[PDB]
Design a protein around this ligand. Structure first.
Ligand SMILES: CCCCCCCCCCCCCCCCCC(=O)OC[C@H](CO[C@@H]1O[C@H](CO[C@H]2O[C@H](CO)[C@H](O)[C@H](O)[C@H]2O)[C@H](O)[C@H](O)[C@H]1O)OC(=O)CCCCCCCCCCCCCCCCC
Ligand code: CLA
Ligand code: CLA
Ligand code: CLA
Ligand code: CLA
Ligand code: CLA
Ligand code: CLA
Ligand code: CLA
Ligand SMILES: CC1=C(/C=C/C(C)=C\C=C\C(C)=C\C=C\C=C(C)\C=C/C=C(C)/C=C/C2=C(C)CCCC2(C)C)C(C)(C)CCC1
Ligand SMILES: CC1=C(C/C=C(\C)CCC[C@H](C)CCC[C@H](C)CCCC(C)C)C(=O)c2ccccc2C1=O
Ligand code: SF4
Ligand code: SF4
Ligand code: SF4
Lengths: 728, 319, 80, 60, 141, 29
């Protein structure tokens, strides 16, 4: 009868809470009034479209302003000594010298420097003028409108799909593997061959003439002939200059390895062959599940067949087909887990093997990106583990999964939790113990007494990969190894050359300071997983509260009685888990930032010597590289690092409000409000105004979220200001 | 008791007032300074907010030995009168100038004190009963809550008021001593040369302490120098305690941010592990009470904070 | 309002009625238990959900449960 | 005087007319004194009145 | 047996407090308490303040039923008295509440059939997949 | 200065002004 339209219960709430929950309840379909599986799936589908339309519009927006407000064309001509423009600024709040200050580049007013690496992205892909950016902006905007269209389209009763269709998993897998993965990477490879490669060779190929231009001299003869080697006949020379004819070859598909020496990025020929190769594996593999032809696998049959003899895995995977196909949260958990891993995967491979020409020369961009994807990966992981327990509560069928791997999982969960506890306490005690030991020796002027363990195991791996520093002589280090002799005339010359250039990021040199920090990160991993896993497995029931599953995923507590039950819900478990996310990726991003900062600065001996103790982090990382940042203004004058320092403090202030909502809880605030609501009602003149919605204190769960949110935002923004301002 | 509502509501008002018109001034300064508008700032140069009363009272204090206290030869203190007295080339005492920056910090104080009073007085006046919990008196002085009912009743007790009162007190007192230390090194202390004075921090206060960035940089960042490099010296213990106090401060946050529901289940799993190996204790392992969680929290928070400021000042001022 | 239920494990020791601040529960005759009496929740529209009732129950596991549900002016402890 | 200010404040009386007048004519008040661009009144439409400064990586 | 009549009787001595009534009593439901105090002895105002009781019938005015059952339990335990109490509506109607059936809820009285009484152990509840596709909860089965 | 003189103060005020107005009426009514 009032908004929340989707909840009678919340709509009848007389207070301001109705509002808050209404905002908070909006996307939870299963909890709305008179909901069905059909409406659930259909709303989810439409929502996916909605997301896509926002994404395409967002991307088009970037291209739009780079083309309209940027210096894209000044960059292409001189990428090394021009700062890429993101956007113009029109701020009526700025003072006279502010407008002078922010006018960087070739700009006719105040501008901001892009640290997204979209320049080098574009530029490496083939984008040459503002025109190209405009056309792409129009296109993707058109795709946005199309997606919006499509959302409302399959909302009508004629175009409403049936639940059976949504449950056709085999078909979606076949199509996504073959088409979405296979075809689209094949088509990209098409783009690299037809546009990117020629663009790097200095021949501008556009919509109007591609069809008329030969990418290879004897094109499409090798292809059908099976003389594929001709496509790798003459690669670009070692003196090739990117985007110019000088030193350019004709090959379209190679396995060279290493980098394009002047740009220091992967070879677009290697990238072409890569996308093409995977494309084939995807296309062949995408014909694996049974649909409407009779040929193909059964998922159910595969899963149910995989039960080992002598019941060492119980009933194996029997019943998982149904509990997965039914459970949406399960699918989102698997998806988020995989997506989180690959997000960090991307982050860790991109920095050490950059793919873009004249990236990695851009320090700030690289730092910004690598922080970006690791934090995104962290949040995504916590979320994976957050729809973990939502499954465990709402979705699991105890009878239908009897004695399976899943039920057996629940069975020995105390073992799992307790052994994670062991693994985290071990690390926590020893690593901290060895650091603080290292500090005390530093303090007393005896650094020779430090406990510095050399990372022999990683140093071994680097040796097996062909770095020769450590002199183990294994695999790709040793010249008398089959592994060496096999591919020595393939790509190893490009590889080995790149691994041993220590001015690049590829498999950096490692010492005892590396050793400690990785075990700090391991502490990060294991503990966060302890919170999340514990929260997932005890979502259903515990000894304190056996009937927890009757309440659901978020609840304040179960009262003060029998000891006290604050932060008992799996919700709260995930909440607690976010703090470790934050702390852990905080450590990882620092690790990253410094070990590069000292590389770029030209003194890696700063890192190796101060990373072995924590004051070293405090003094040589934090205290040193904020010098310029905090100076952005002083009583004497100003410079260009105004916004970062403003935002630095902004983040800190957000960070401390969070503490407010986290530490102080409801009873104080409500009674505060209780006196205020009397105060209003017997204040004359003001008497004549009264509220419609009774003023009430935010909930516990509300307080829980609002703290967390402020904390995270402050975290991110503060670092971002630091990272960028210092690296720049 | 019969009009507590008016008292607490008015204290609430006056505190929001004070908060806006003190913090708000610093945020305003930071924004104007960031936007390139120094002529619009709250400062002796641009904006003037002179402590006219204080200056009057200082005026009356130095002239007093002549008029209102004839038998008194010099002033009670040189921070009112003139006559800069110095010993061993160091400044013992000298007239303290009062400007806009001092106007600022005092009103911050007065804000902080008023907030602390808000929390504690509210605590004492409604200890027995309120609109939410009329029978609070029966429940005790020290107790966590009365459940998730009534929308949720977290931290209703008088203890919880003392709890939160400790944080604001720490806040207030911390700005006072920072005020003190910066004030003293910039406008008072230093060496005495050819008929002239070189202060320790060169009178940056009046111009720097008007913005948050000035504290961040000219006080915190610049001064922490001697503590952060105290290694290899006599003062290294202060660096160790510097780090240790951060540790313990941060360590408090685990207790403050969490609740014993998690911890008790954790303990269930660990207890399993013990029982599996016949090493379970007779004294059944239990998570701390909610109240104890709060007490441990506030205790470690204070100890960490205070000990960090302690290692800071002493290494700073000794070196 | 909040939901309050009494299960059959009730002993009828009456602590949960005697503890309530808003008189939601009452004692009724029954045939199941040694005390010849069981607890009941006929007035849950006045239930606040403060969970004194639960804290008062001696049975293992508790034989009163309060499920915090849709919230109304009374359940939110309002006097304004 | 009561006759001066009944007749004067009787056409703007209605509540529906305010969301039509105050919103659209109020935007017409921002879009007038908002678009009207020189040093005379604000220091941004003034623009940069000096030659560009040198960056950190030898940029324009 | 019959519920209480709702007459006019004088409230006990009180200088007045800020904790008392507000807009809720005017446009929502306020609450009234009735009892026969023997002597004049002091009591704790549950909305703050000292107040002297009078002999004979005394009535008070509150805007929440907790403020009754905090007082009633303070009148019942300390002074050993026995108060009745009921609601009010702003059109002039009354709702008789306590004791609902003359007998107080803790000791058993015939004619009070059991409500929200589940007749199984709590662990004999079904899993919440078996209550989707509805508007139902986990206990009512 | 042509476009951003119009679109900045409309996105700054006139979008949130009628958004806070029409979303308020959606909440209370
Ligand atoms: C955009 C800017 C933000 C604008 C609006 C949001 C701000 C206000 C949010 C606070 C409100 C939270 C809240 O309502 O508080 C309570 C809510 C809802 O709780 C629910 O409360 C419900 C209330 O019940 C009532 O309502 C029900 C129907 O709704 C029924 O009627 C029911 O019978 C009735 O009792 C039930 O009790 C449910 O059991 C219970 O789950 O808690 C929750 O679930 C929270 C809602 C789910 C959130 C999803 C997880 C978010 C995790 C984020 C992690 C950080 C991410 C940061 C990234 C930063 C990157 C840069
Ligand atoms: C969806 C992505 C996106 C994003 C994040 C932004 C963000 C921005 N745009 Mg917008 N803009 C976008 C797409 C986007 N734009 C698109 C696709 C177009 C149409 C081609 C425009 C056309 C546009 C104009 C005409 C203006 C802005 C302006 C702005 C700025 C002020 C906000 C505003 O006017 O609204 C801001 C940086 C204003 C600005 O630069 O100041 C401005 O005047 N934008
Ligand atoms: C070759 C055919 C094809 C292609 C190109 C796609 C492409 C896509 N599908 Mg899929 N889909 C396909 C066949 C295909 N689908 C079939 C046959 C079915 C039914 C069996 C589905 C059912 C399906 C669902 C249910 C959803 C997608 C979604 C998506 C999008 C995933 C998000 C992303 O950008 O990555 C993507 C555009 C998701 C989306 O974003 O919408 C989504 O929700 N698809
Ligand atoms: C979906 C992507 C795509 C598309 C639409 C095209 C389209 C085309 N390609 Mg192809 N091409 C692609 C991917 C793509 N290519 C990829 C991934 C590779 C790498 C193996 C090549 C390598 C390639 C070569 C080497 C040649 C073509 C050629 C052609 C043309 C003739 C094909 C024919 O008749 O058989 C045609 C316009 C021929 C041409 O004349 O151009 C030609 O010589 N293509
Ligand atoms: C594809 C991504 C995706 C999707 C579609 C959903 C969808 C949903 N999430 Mg979310 N969630 C996600 C990612 C996602 N989540 C991530 C990345 C995180 C970690 C930050 C979370 C953490 C999370 C929690 C902790 C909760 C939800 C909840 C919800 C539901 C209600 C949210 C609301 O109303 O506000 C809804 C079904 C809520 C629910 O009802 O369950 C809830 O409590 N989500
Ligand atoms: C600097 C602050 C700090 C410190 C020193 C610790 C220390 C610890 N925490 Mg953590 N923790 C913290 C903040 C901190 N926590 C915060 C702010 C929260 C959020 C409320 C948590 C939530 C948390 C959980 C949920 C768990 C730990 C656990 C642990 C232990 C991990 C094992 C180890 O390293 O030894 C250890 C005693 C784990 C444990 O006890 O095992 C565990 O499960 N902590
Ligand atoms: C920078 C962080 C921050 C900020 C911005 C605020 C802001 C505020 N707090 Mg504080 N508060 C903080 C941290 C912070 N708090 C922390 C960390 C805690 C936990 C101890 C508290 C605990 C707290 C209490 C208990 C009270 C305030 C109060 C207030 C308000 C004071 C009146 C005013 O200025 O308006 C104000 C909204 C007072 C209020 O309600 O007014 C009040 O009584 N705060
Ligand atoms: C986002 C929308 C927006 C818009 C359209 C404006 C527009 C304006 N502001 Mg600003 N201002 C904004 C946000 C905005 N402000 C915010 C959010 C704040 C609060 C922090 C302020 C606080 C503010 C002040 C205090 C003053 C201005 C002033 C001005 C004017 C400066 C240029 C002039 O002389 O004419 C102009 C009309 C100045 C003015 O009107 O004179 C002025 O003194 N603004
Ligand atoms: C990312 C990016 C972007 C975007 C993109 C996109 C989204 C795209 C799409 C799409 C595209 C751009 C596509 C194209 C296509 C093409 C084609 C497709 C063609 C073809 C032709 C032909 C002639 C062929 C034929 C044939 C044959 C011969 C045989 C077999 C069959 C067939 C039919 C195939 C931009 C730039 C904005 C920005 C930057 C980055
Ligand atoms: C970690 C944690 C716990 C669990 C932590 C506990 C129980 C702390 C106590 C642990 C110490 C180590 C036990 C003391 C043991 C004796 C001193 C004997 C040890 C034997 C010799 C080594 C001396 C809570 O109880 C808690 C409660 C409320 C909010 C947050 C938290 C919280 O964060
Ligand atoms: S959360 Fe607030 S209310 Fe629920 S138990 Fe812990 S303290 Fe008592
Ligand atoms: S407390 Fe548990 S046992 Fe005693 S009465 Fe209420 S329900 Fe029956
Ligand atoms: S919850 Fe508090 S109020 Fe609701 S019944 Fe149990 S005790 Fe009486």
């Amino acid at each position: 009868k009032l908004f929340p339209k989707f909840s009678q219960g919340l709509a009848q709430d007389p207070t301001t809470r109705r509002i808050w929950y209404g905002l908070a309840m909006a996307h939870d379909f299963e909890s709305h009034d008179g909901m069905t599986e059909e409406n659930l799936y259909q709303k989810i589908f439409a929502s996916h479209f909605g997301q896509l339309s926002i994404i395409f519009l967002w991307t088009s927006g970037n291209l739009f302003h780079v083309a309209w407000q940027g210096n894209f064309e000044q960059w292409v001509t001189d990428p090394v000594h021009i700062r890429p423009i993101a956007h113009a600024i029109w701020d009526p709040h700025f003072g006279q010298p502010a407008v002078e200050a922010f006018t960087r580049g070739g700009a006719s007013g105040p501008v901001n420097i892009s640290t997204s690496g979209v320049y080098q992205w574009w530029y490496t892909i083939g984008m040459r003028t503002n025109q190209d950016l405009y056309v792409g902006s129009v296109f993707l905007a058109l795709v946005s409108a199309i997606f919006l269209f499509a959302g409302w389209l399959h909302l009508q009763p004629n175009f409403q799909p049936s639940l059976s269709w949504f449950k056709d998993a085999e078909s979606r897998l076949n199509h996504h593997l073959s088409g979405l993965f296979g075809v689209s990477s094949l088509a990209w490879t098409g783009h690299l061959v037809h546009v990117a490669i020629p663009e790097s060779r200095g021949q501008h190929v556009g919509w109007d003439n591609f069809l008329s231009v030969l990418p290879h001299p004897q094109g499409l003869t090798p292809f059908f002939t099976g003389n594929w080697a001709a496509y790798a006949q003459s690669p670009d020379t070692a003196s090739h200059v990117f985007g110019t004819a000088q030193g350019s070859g004709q090959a379209i598909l190679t396995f060279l390895g290493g980098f394009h020496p002047q740009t220091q990025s992967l070879w677009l020929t290697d990238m072409a062959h890569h996308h093409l190769a995977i494309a084939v594996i995807f296309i062949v593999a995408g014909h694996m599940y049974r649909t409407n032809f009779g040929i193909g696998h059964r998922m159910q049959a595969i899963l149910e067949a995989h039960t080992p003899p002598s019941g060492s895995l119980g009933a194996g995977h029997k019943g998982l087909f149904d509990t997965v196909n039914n459970s949406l949260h399960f699918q989102l958990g698997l998806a988020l887990a995989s997506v989180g891993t690959i997000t960090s995967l991307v982050a860790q491979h991109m920095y050490s093997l950059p793919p873009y020409a004249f990236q990695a020369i851009d320090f700030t961009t690289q730092a910004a990106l690598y922080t970006h994807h690791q934090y995104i990966a962290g949040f995504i992981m916590c979320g994976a583990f957050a729809h973990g327990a939502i499954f465990f509560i709402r979705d699991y069928d105890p009878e239908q999964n009897k004695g399976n791997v899943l039920a057996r999982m629940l069975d020995h969960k105390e073992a799992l939790i307790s052994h994670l506890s062991w693994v985290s306490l071990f690390l926590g005690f020893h690593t901290l113990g060895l650091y603080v030991h290292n500090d005390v020796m530093q303090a007393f002027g005896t650094p020779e007494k430090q406990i510095l363990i050399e990372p022999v195991f990683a140093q071994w791996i680097q040796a097996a990969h062909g770095k020769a520093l450590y002199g183990f002589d294994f695999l790709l280090s040793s010249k008398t190894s089959a592994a060496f002799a096999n591919g020595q005339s393939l790509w190893l010359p490009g590889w080995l050359d790149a691994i041993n250039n220590n001015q690049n990021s590829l498999f950096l040199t490692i010492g005892p300071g590396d050793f400690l920090v990785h075990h700090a990160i391991a502490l990060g991993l294991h503990t966060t997983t302890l919170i999340l896993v514990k929260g997932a497995l005890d979502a259903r029931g515990s000894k304190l509260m056996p009937d927890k599953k009757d309440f659901g995923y978020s609840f304040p507590c179960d009262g003060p009685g029998r000891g006290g039950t604050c932060d008992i819900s799996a919700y709260d478990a995930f909440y607690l888990a976010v703090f470790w996310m934050l702390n852990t990726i905080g450590w990882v991003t620092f690790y990253w930032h410094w070990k590069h900062l000292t590389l770029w600065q030209g003194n890696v001996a700063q890192f190796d010597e101060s990373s072995t103790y924590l004051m070293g982090w405090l003094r040589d990382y934090l205290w040193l590289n904020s010098s310029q940042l905090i100076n952005g203004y002083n009583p004497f004058g100003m410079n260009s690092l105004s916004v970062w320092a403003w935002t630095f403090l902004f983040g800190h202030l957000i960070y401390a409000t969070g503490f407010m909502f986290l530490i102080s809880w409801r009873g104080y605030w409500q009674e505060l409000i209780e006196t205020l609501v009397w105060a209003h009602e017997k204040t004359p003149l003001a008497n004549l105004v009264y509220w419609k919605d009774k003023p009430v204190a935010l909930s516990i769960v509300q307080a829980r979220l609002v703290g967390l949110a402020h904390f995270s935002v402050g975290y991110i923004f503060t670092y971002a200001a630091f990272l960028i301002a210092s690296t720049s | 008791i019969r009009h507590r509502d008016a008292i607490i509501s008015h204290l609430n008002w006056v505190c929001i007032f004070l908060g806006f018109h003190s913090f708000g001034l610093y945020i305003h300064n930071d924004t104007m300074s960031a936007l390139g508008r120094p002529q619009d700032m709250f400062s002796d140069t641009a904006i003037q907010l002179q402590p006219v009363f204080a200056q009057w009272i200082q005026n009356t204090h130095f002239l007093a030995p002549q008029l209102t206290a004839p038998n008194a030869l010099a002033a009670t203190s040189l921070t009112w009168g003139g006559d800069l007295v110095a010993v061993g080339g160091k400044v013992a005492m000298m007239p303290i100038s009062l400007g806009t920056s001092d106007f600022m910090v005092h009103h911050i104080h007065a804000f902080t004190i008023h907030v602390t009073v808000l929390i504690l007085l509210k605590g004492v006046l409604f200890a027995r009963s309120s609109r939410l919990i009329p029978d609070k008196a029966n429940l005790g002085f020290r107790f966590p809550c009365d459940g998730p009912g009534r929308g949720g009743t977290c931290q209703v007790s008088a203890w919880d008021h003392v709890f939160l009162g400790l944080f604001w007190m720490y806040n207030s007192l911390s700005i006072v001593i920072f005020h003190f230390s910066w004030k003293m090194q910039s406008d008072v202390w230093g060496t005495v040369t050819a008929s002239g004075v070189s202060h320790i921090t060169g009178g940056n206060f009046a111009q720097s302490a008007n913005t948050i960035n000035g504290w961040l940089r000219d006080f915190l960042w610049a001064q922490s120098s001697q503590v952060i490099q105290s290694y290899g010296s006599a003062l290294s213990a202060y660096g160790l305690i510097f780090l240790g106090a951060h540790f313990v401060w941060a360590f408090s946050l685990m207790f403050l941010f969490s609740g014993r529901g998690y911890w008790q289940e954790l303990i269930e799993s660990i207890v399993w592990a013990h029982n599996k190996l016949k090493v379970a204790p007779a004294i059944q392992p239990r998570a701390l009470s909610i109240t104890q969680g709060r007490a441990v929290g506030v205790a470690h928070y204070l100890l960490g904070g205070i000990a960090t400021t302690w290692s800071f000042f002493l290494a700073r001022i000794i070196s | 309002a909040h939901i309050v239920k009494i299960y059959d494990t009730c002993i009828g020791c009456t602590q949960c009625v005697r503890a309530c601040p808003l008189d939601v529960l009452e004692m009724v005759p029954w045939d199941g238990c040694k005390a010849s009496q069981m607890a009941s929740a006929p007035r849950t529209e006045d239930c606040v959900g403060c969970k004194r009732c639960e804290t008062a129950c001696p049975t293992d596991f508790l034989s009163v449960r309060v499920y915090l549900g849709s919230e109304s002016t009374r359940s939110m402890g309002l006097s304004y | 005087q009561a006759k001066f200010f009944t007749q004067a404040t009787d056409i703007i009386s209605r509540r529906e007319s305010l969301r039509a007048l105050v919103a659209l004519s109020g935007i017409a008040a921002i879009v007038t004194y908002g678009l009207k661009a020189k040093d005379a009144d604000l220091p941004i439409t003034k623009g940069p009145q000096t030659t560009g400064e040198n960056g950190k990586g030898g940029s324009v | 047996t019959v519920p209480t009549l709702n007459p006019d009787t004088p409230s006990p001595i009180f200088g007045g407090s800020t904790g008392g009534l507000l807009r809720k009593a005017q446009t929502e439901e306020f609450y009234v308490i009735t009892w026969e105090a023997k002597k004049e002895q002091i009591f704790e105002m549950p909305t703050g303040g000292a107040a002297i009781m009078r002999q004979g019938p005394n009535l008070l005015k509150f805007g929440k039923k907790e403020q009754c059952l905090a007082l009633t339990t303070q009148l019942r335990n300390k002074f050993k008295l026995t108060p009745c109490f009921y609601r009010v509506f702003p059109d002039g109607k009354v709702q008789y509440l306590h004791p609902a059936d003359g007998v107080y809820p803790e000791k058993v009285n015939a004619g009070r059939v059991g409500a929200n009484q589940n007749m199984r152990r709590i662990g004999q509840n079904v899993n919440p997949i078996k209550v989707k596709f509805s508007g139902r909860m986990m206990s009512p089965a | 200065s042509w476009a951003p003189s119009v679109f900045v103060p409309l996105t700054g005020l006139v979008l949130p002004a009628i958004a806070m107005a029409t979303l308020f009426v959606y909440i209370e009514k």
